[PDB]
C-alpha cells in the first residue's frame, strides 16, 4: 500500500546489483534494508565494508544515507541475506542508481494514484509490471513513450481510469522583466512591434506605453539566463535604429 | 463637429462638473483617487447638443408638444477647467483656447468670492466677455435672499468689461431652468468666424496614450494629442511639427504624421476650427504618457513658429491683486524674480531682465513658441501659491 514488490521474486536473486542504506552498526556490520523491497532487510559484515578498519567516528557519519551494493548469498526463506558493496565497480553507481532513480520517480506517481485514489499500491503496480518491466526495461522510459505510444495503455486493462489521467498531468519557470520603454519618438511603435515579433516567438505582457512585464520561461532555471540577456540585447539594438529610448531593469 | 469652444468657470466645490452633467450627461470623471473625492487636474470634457424646437437635449420633439422634430442648430463642446487658486495654470491654458465663457455662482456662498472674481478678470483679459452667468446652488436659498444675491451680483457687474451678460437660476442636480441657458447659447453667444486660409495652428492641452493594460504589442496604438484648433481645418493625412521641442541645455521640435483627427465620438475626415480635438499621430504613446503634451504648439509641416526664451513683453497690471479674500496692493514688479507667464497654453516660469514704463524683458527657463503676437496672462508668487498680477503681449 505504501511500497511493494518490484520484479515478482521474494528475494533479490544471486548477483543482482541493489541499493541499501546503512541503519546502525554495533559489532556485526550494518543492519541495512533492501531499498527495492523497502520493508525487507539484509545485512553486511565488517570486512565487506571499506577495507581500512573503519573507526567509530568514521562509522557514525554513514548511517541513514544510502549507497549501491550487490548480494553475495540469499536465504530462500529467511530474509537474512549477505550484502556486498566492497566488490562493486564504480559503473554500478551509474548503472543501478539511475535505474533505481528511474524507479524512484514511478514511486512518486504510483502513490497518489494508489492512496489518494484509496486502493493498495501493489494491485495497480502488478497490472503494470509483467507487460512493461518484463517485456522490456521498466516502465518510466515507457511512461515517456506511453504519452505518445498508446499501444501500452491498451496493452493492459485499466482497472481504474483516474490513473490514466493522473499520469499525463504530472510528467506531461518565469523570469520577470519590467523593461521600461521610455521613448520620445515617431517610429517607436514599429520598433516595439519588431521587438515583440522576436522575443515572444516567452510570456510578454503590455502594462502601458512605457512599462512591459515579460516573464521569460527557463528550463534549467539557468537556461533563461541566455534568454533574458538576449532579449535585452535585442531591445538595445532596436531603439537606436528608429529614434526613441528604451531602458531595461 | 464641435462648433464653438465654450468654457465653464466658477469657485472650487460649487459644481462645474455637476453643471456639465446636467447639460450633457457626459461626466468629467473626477479621477486619480485624489480627485475622485476632491478636484480635477485635467480639463473636463462634454459634448452638448443644440437642435431647437421652432414649430434641445435630444433630436426628437416628442416632449415639447408639437411632433415637428428638433431642428438642428449646433453641436457644442465644453472647456471645464479647475477653479482652484493653486491650479490656475490649467485654467489660463483653457482661456486662450475658448471662444466663450459660462459663469457659475452659488446662492448661499458669497457674491465677492475671490476665485470667481479672478476667473472673471482672466476672461476679461483674454477676450472672453461672452459669459452666460448661472446661479447654481439656488435649491437652498430663500425667496428674498436669492433676489438680494442677484442684486449684489448686478451691482458688482457695472464697472467690469461685462455689462449686460445674462443671468439664469439653474439647479444642476434637480435638472430645471436650463432651457433658458440653451436658448442663450444660440442667442447671446454667436460663434466668431473661423475660416480655411488663416494659417493652421493647433494648441495642445492634453497628452493621451490609448495603450490599454492587457493587450499584445502585435496589436499596437500610437500617440493621441488632445488639443484645440483656432485657425486652419486640419484634414486626414498631414505631417506635423510640435515646436516647443524635446529637451537634450537645448530643445528640439517633434515631428508627427497624422494617424487620426478625432472629434465628437466618431473619427472624421476633417477638423474644422473652434473645437477641441483628439489628434492621433504617428508619435510614440510613451511621450503621450500622462501630462507631457500640455501647453505645446502644433503646426502643419512647412511652417515657422519661433521658440523664444528671451522675450519682449508689453505688460499691463492691476492696482490691487486677485486670488485672495484681503485684496492686496500691487507692489511694483521686482527684477530677477520667478513669475509665471501664461501664453496661449504655456505656463512658463520666467525671470525679469528689465522693468521700463509699459515694457518688460523676460528670461524663460522653459522655451515657448510665438507665431503671432500671442496673448498673455501673468502671475506671481507673493502668498506661496500663484496669484494673478496682470497681463501682457509679446511685442514680436
UniProtKB/Swiss-Prot annotation, chain A:
The keyword tRNA processing does not apply. The keyword Protein biosynthesis applies. It comes from the Eukaryota. Gene3D superfamilies: EIF_2_alpha, Nucleic acid-binding proteins, Translation initiation factor 2, subunit 1, domain 2. GO terms for cellular component: cytoplasm; cytoplasmic stress granule; cytosol; eukaryotic 48S preinitiation complex; eukaryotic translation initiation factor 2 complex; multi-eIF complex; ribosome. Coiled coil: none annotated. Keywords: Cytoplasm, Initiation factor, Phosphoprotein, Protein biosynthesis, RNA-binding. The modification Phosphoserine is found at residue 50. InterPro entries: NA-bd_OB-fold (IPR012340), S1_domain (IPR003029), S1_IF2_alpha (IPR044126), TIF2_asu_C (IPR024055), TIF2_asu_middle_sf (IPR024054), TIF_2_asu (IPR011488). Phosphorylated; phosphorylation on Ser-50 by the GCN2 protein kinase occurs in response to low amino acid, carbon, or purine availability. Phosphorylation inhibits the guanine nucleotide exchange factor activity of the eIF2B complex. Changing residue 204 to E: Abolishes binding to the eIF2 complex alpha subunit GCD11. Does not affect its interaction with CDC123. Its main location: cytoplasm. Pfam families: EIF_2_alpha, S1. Residues 15-86 form the S1 motif domain. Eukaryotic translation initiation factor 2 eIF2 is a heterotrimeric complex composed of an alpha, a beta and a gamma subunit. The factors eIF-1, eIF-2, eIF-3, TIF5/eIF-5 and methionyl-tRNAi form a multifactor complex (MFC) that may bind to the 40S ribosome. Interacts with CDC123; the interaction is direct. Interacts with GCD1. Present with 17100 molecules/cell in log phase SD medium. Belongs to the eIF-2-alpha family. eIF-2 functions in the early steps of protein synthesis by forming a ternary complex with GTP and initiator tRNA. This complex binds to a 40S ribosomal subunit, followed by mRNA binding to form a 43S pre-initiation complex. Junction of the 60S ribosomal subunit to form the 80S initiation complex is preceded by hydrolysis of the GTP bound to eIF-2 and release of an eIF-2-GDP binary complex. In order for eIF-2 to recycle and catalyze another round of initiation, the GDP bound to eIF-2 must exchange with GTP by way of a reaction catalyzed by eIF2B. This is Eukaryotic translation initiation factor 2 subunit alpha. It comes from Saccharomyces cerevisiae (strain ATCC 204508 / S288c).
UniProtKB/Swiss-Prot annotation, chain B:
Its main location: cytoplasm. Changing residue 168 to R: Abolishes binding to SUI3 but not to SUI2 or CDC123. Abolishes interactions with the eIF2B complex subunits GCD6 and GCD7. It is an enzyme of class 3 (hydrolase). It comes from Saccharomyces cerevisiae (strain ATCC 204508 / S288c) (Baker's yeast). This is Eukaryotic translation initiation factor 2 subunit gamma. The lineage of its organism: Eukaryota, Fungi, Dikarya, Ascomycota, Saccharomycotina. Its EC number is 3.6.5.3. Disruption phenotype: Inviable. Changing residue 168 to K: Impairs eIF2 complex formation by impairing binding to SUI3 but not SUI2. Reduces cell population growth. It comes from the Eukaryota.
Amino acid at each position: 500500500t505504501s511500497h511493494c514488490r518490484f520484479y515478482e521474486n521474494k528475494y533479490p536473486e544471486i548477483d543482482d546489483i541493489v541499493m541499501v542504506n546503512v541503519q546502525q552498526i554495533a559489532e556485526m556490520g550494518a543492519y541495512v534494508k533492501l531499498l527495492e523491497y523497502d520493508n525487507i532487510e539484509g545485512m553486511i559484515l565488517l570486512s565487506e565494508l571499506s577495507r581500512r578498519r573503519i573507526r567509530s567516528i568514521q562509522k557514525l557519519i554513514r548511517v541513514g544515507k544510502n549507497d549501491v551494493a550487490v548480494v553475495l548469498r540469499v536465504d530462500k526463506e529467511k530474509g537474512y541475506i549477505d550484502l556486498s558493496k566492497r566488490r562493486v565497480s564504480s559503473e554500478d553507481i551509474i548503472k543501478c542508481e539511475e535505474k533505481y532513480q528511474k524507479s524512484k520517480t514511478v514511486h512518486s506517481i504510483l502513490r497518489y494514484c494508489a492512496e489518494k485514489f484509496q486502493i493498495p499500491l501493489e494491485e495497480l503496480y502488478k497490472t503494470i509490471a509483467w507487460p512493461l518491466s518484463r517485456k522490456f526495461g521498466h516502465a518510466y522510459e515507457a511512461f515517456k513513450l506511453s504519452i505518445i505510444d498508446e499501444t501500452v495503455w491498451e496493452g493492459i486493462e485499466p482497472p481504474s481510469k483516474d490513473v490514466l489521467d493522473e499520469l499525463k498531468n504530472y510528467i506531461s519557470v518565469k523570469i520577470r522583466a519590467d523593461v521600461e520603454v521610455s521613448c520620445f519618438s515617431y517610429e517607436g511603435i514599429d520598433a516595439i512591434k519588431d521587438a515583440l515579433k522576436s522575443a515572444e516567438d516567452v510570456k510578454v505582457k503590455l502594462v502601458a506605453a512605457p512599462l512591459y512585464v515579460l516573464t521569460t520561461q527557463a528550463l534549467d532555471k539557468q537556461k533563461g539566463i541566455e534568454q533574458l540577456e538576449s532579449a535585452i540585447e535585442k531591445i538595445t539594438e532596436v531603439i537606436t535604429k528608429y529614434g526613441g529610448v528604451c531602458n531595461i531593469t | 463637429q464641435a462648433t464653438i469652444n465654450i468654457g465653464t468657470i466658477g469657485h472650487v466645490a460649487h459644481g462645474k462638473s455637476t453643471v456639465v452633467r446636467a447639460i450633457s450627461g457626459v461626466q468629467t470623471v473626477r479621477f486619480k483617487d485624489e480627485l475622485e473625492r476632491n478636484i480635477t487636474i485635467k480639463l473636463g470634457y462634454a459634448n452638448a447638443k443644440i437642435y431647437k424646437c421652432q414649430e434641445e437635449i435630444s433630436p426628437k420633439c416628442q416632449r415639447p408638444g408639437c411632433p415637428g422634430r428638433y431642428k438642428l442648430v449646433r453641436h457644442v463642446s465644453f472647456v471645464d477647467c479647475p477653479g482652484h487658486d493653486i491650479l490656475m495654470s490649467t485654467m489660463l491654458s483653457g482661456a486662450a483656447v475658448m471662444d466663450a465663457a459660462l459663469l457659475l455662482i452659488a446662492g448661499n456662498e458669497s457674491c465677492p468670492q475671490p476665485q470667481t472674481s479672478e476667473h472673471l478678470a482672466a476672461i476679461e483679459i483674454m477676450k472672453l466677455k461672452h459669459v452666460i452667468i448661472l446661479q447654481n446652488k439656488v435649491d437652498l436659498m430663500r425667496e428674498e435672499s436669492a433676489l438680494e444675491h442677484q442684486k449684489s451680483i448686478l451691482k458688482f457687474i457695472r464697472g467690469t468689461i461685462a455689462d449686460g451678460a445674462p443671468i439664469v437660476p439653474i439647479s444642476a442636480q434637480l435638472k430645471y431652468n436650463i432651457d433658458a441657458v440653451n436658448e442663450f447659447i444660440v442667442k447671446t453667444i454667436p460663434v466668431p468666424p473661423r475660416d480655411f486660409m488663416i494659417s493652421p495652428r493647433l494648441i495642445v492641452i492634453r497628452s493621451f496614450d490609448v495603450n490599454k493594460p492587457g493587450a499584445e504589442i502585435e496589436d499596437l496604438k500610437g500617440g493621441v494629442a488632445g488639443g484645440s484648433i483656432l485657425n486652419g481645418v486640419f484634414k486626414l493625412g498631414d505631417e506635423i511639427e510640435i515646436r516647443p521641442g524635446i529637451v537634450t541645455i537645448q530643445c528640439k521640435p517633434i515631428f508627427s504624421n497624422i494617424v487620426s483627427l478625432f472629434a465628437e465620438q466618431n473619427d472624421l475626415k476633417f477638423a474644422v476650427p473652434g473645437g477641441l480635438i483628439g489628434v492621433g499621430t504617428k508619435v510614440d504613446p510613451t511621450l503621450c504618457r500622462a501630462d507631457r503634451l500640455v501647453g505645446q504648439v502644433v503646426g502643419a509641416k512647412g511652417h515657422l513658429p519661433n521658440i523664444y526664451t528671451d522675450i519682449e513683453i508689453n505688460y499691463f497690471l492691476l492696482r490691487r491683486l486677485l486670488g485672495v479674500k484681503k485684496q492686496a496692493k500691487v507692489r511694483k514688479l521686482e527684477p530677477n524674480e520667478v513669475l509665471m507667464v501664461n501664453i496661449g497654453s504655456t505656463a512658463t516660469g520666467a525671470r525679469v531682465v528689465a522693468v521700463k514704463a509699459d515694457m518688460a524683458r523676460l528670461q524663460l527657463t522653459s522655451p515657448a513658441c510665438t507665431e503671432i503676437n500671442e496673448k498673455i496672462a501673468l502671475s506671481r508668487r507673493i502668498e506661496k501659491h500663484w496669484r494673478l498680477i496682470g497681463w501682457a503681449t509679446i511685442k514680436k
